[PDB]
Amino acid sequence: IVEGSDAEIGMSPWQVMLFRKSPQELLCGASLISDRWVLTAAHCLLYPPWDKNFTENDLLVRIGKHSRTRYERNIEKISMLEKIYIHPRYNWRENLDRDIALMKLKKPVAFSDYIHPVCLPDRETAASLLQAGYKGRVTGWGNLKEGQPSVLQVVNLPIVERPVCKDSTRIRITDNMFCAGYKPDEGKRGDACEGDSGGPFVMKSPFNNRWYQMGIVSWGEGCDRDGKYGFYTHVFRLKKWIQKVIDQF
């Protein structure tokens, strides 16, 4: 996260860390959507242009964390994956379209102050909230500059108009993404950066005061470059696949 601040304790209790076993290293962020499911970006797991193809045993999910590097004793829980589901039509060859994957935990995690799932959006929350100007919140332990934080970082970013997102890049944008960020003139900054992928973009409903996850940190060129924007998997557009996966397995 570039130009964000330290998180408060308990502030994002769904924030999950994707952790390589060997070498032990932060892979990606991710989110806790139930006691058994974690939602992340598919390019965290499988991205052939970089010879990236992780499996269940390559990976540990650490939940409850605040510190990036410490093992937080009595606070975090570390679990192993039982199964990994990548969207059948994730498009890594061209534009990372349908950048989404679900991971099944081998055993359910227990909730506490520091560990609590986020909500997934319904049609009319999505409609109400996914508007240009509306700010959502991205969190992660990735780089601070296009070096790395001690502690979870957070930043708040406005949704950007669809045409503005398209004229900011050569890459072909689809209905399964949206872009967030400040215009160069608005004189505020902020962006995800390496290591933040897979992370939750969330919004608080004013109607019921719950936190919903509308986006997955997906892709962007550079970090916090003027005139560029971050791009996020559009979680509602792909909830049908999510529901399926969850209530099939």
Binding site: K21, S22, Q24, E25, L60, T69, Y71, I78, M80, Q148
Partner: peptide, 11 residues
């Protein structure tokens, strides 16, 4: 950089 985790997990 990363603090070593319990080996119960790395099993």
């Amino acid at each position: 950089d990363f603090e070593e985790i319990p080996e119960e997990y790395l099993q």
